[PDB]
Design a binder for this molecule. Structure first.
Ligand SMILES: N[C@@H](Cc1c[nH]c[nH+]1)C(=O)O
Ligand SMILES: N[C@@H](Cc1c[nH]c[nH+]1)C(=O)O
Ligand code: NI
Length: 302
């Protein structure tokens, strides 16, 4: 039994059913939305810091922590030892993934660049896991439609996101950039960075003078590290205390629309006036993750 799907490398044929899966580099919250944690035998170690992973994975001790590095060679010997039927992986190094795929194990490989693409890739995974994701994907889209409707006619705020260091930002073909855009941010990184995330000189950041700055949830930087950086003292975002760390939500996953909502609410609070934000957040978690009221509580905002 099999199913044909498409990924980064073209058509793939997935043998069914899938018993053991590994998540490398992205999509760590997918098992949470599908209730398939029992099928997971390995996951990139960043995942254990996600709050929906912490809450929904009952036996984290069972799952082998894997590398969260996208560039170095994949650990093919560990992959073979865990005997997965399927490895879902983020392609940060096409050649290294291709190299990895030459060892007898099926890969489903993605490089999600937009929230729209995230949802397509989630649906592809749902085919491999033989789950019906339609209602959950629809909730994701309803939420995107809602944000867009509130931001209609609102002038975007000039901003940028910082990554592991204070001069690494995102540009074209970066899911972070799409998430910023859907949050109502004019990301100046598009002007400087031609693909993914890359460095820029601090003097260009100062010249661009962003009104708001976000920090990648995996970054070691705190908002204070940025606020107190002498290099940034003349920047509007610093002077006006508009520096925010993004929530503990994996970008390539079922909560991407909530990250854009978070950004929109920070950037354009006036756009969300007669909106019951926590009702929206509550129903998002109930539908997407099947949480009950008590379980939803720590995920509500403020
Ligand atoms: N690819 C995801 C997860 C990750 C953790 N470390 C590196 N990447 C991200 O960049 O947000
Ligand atoms: N997810 C990657 C960033 C990236 C986007 N596109 C390619 N790489 C990281 O953790 O750095
Ligand atoms: Ni990454």
């Amino acid at each position: 039994q099999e199913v044909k799907v498409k990924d980064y490398f073209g058509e793939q044929t997935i043998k069914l059913p899938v018993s053991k899966i590994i998540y490398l580099g992205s999509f760590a919250e997918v098992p949470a939305m599908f209730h398939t944690w029992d099928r997971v035998v390995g996951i990139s170690d960043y995942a254990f810091k996600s709050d929906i992973v912490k809450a929904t994975l009952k036996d984290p001790e069972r799952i082998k922590p894997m590398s969260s590095d996208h560039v170095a060679a994949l650990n093919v010997e560990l992959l073979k030892k865990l005997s997965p039927d399927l490895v879902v992986t983020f392609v940060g190094n096409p050649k290294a993934v291709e190299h990895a795929k030459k060892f007898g194990i099926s890969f489903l490989s993605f490089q999600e660049k937009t929230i729209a693409e995230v949802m397509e890739d989630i649906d592809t995974q749902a085919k491999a896991l033989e789950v019906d994701a339609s209602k959950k994907l629809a909730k994701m889209q309803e939420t995107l439609d809602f944000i867009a409707e509130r931001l209609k006619g609102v002038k975007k705020k000039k901003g940028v996101e910082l990554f592991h260091k204070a001069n690494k930002i995102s540009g074209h073909q970066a899911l972070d950039s799409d998430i910023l855009e859907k949050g109502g941010i004019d990301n100046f990184g598009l002007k400087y960075v031609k693909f993914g995330r890359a460095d820029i000189s601090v003097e260009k950041i100062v010249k661009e003078n962003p009104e708001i700055i976000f920090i990648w949830w995996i970054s070691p930087l705190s908002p204070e590290d940025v606020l107190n950086n002498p290099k940034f003292a003349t920047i509007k975002a610093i002077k006006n205390k508009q520096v925010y760390k993004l929530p503990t939500m994996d970008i390539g996953g079922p909560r991407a629309p909530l990250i854009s909502l978070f950004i929109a609410l920070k950037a354009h609070p006036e756009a969300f006036k007669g909106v019951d934000i926590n009702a929206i957040v509550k129903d998002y978690y109930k539908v997407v993750f099947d949480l009950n009221d008590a379980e939803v509580e720590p995920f509500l905002w403020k």
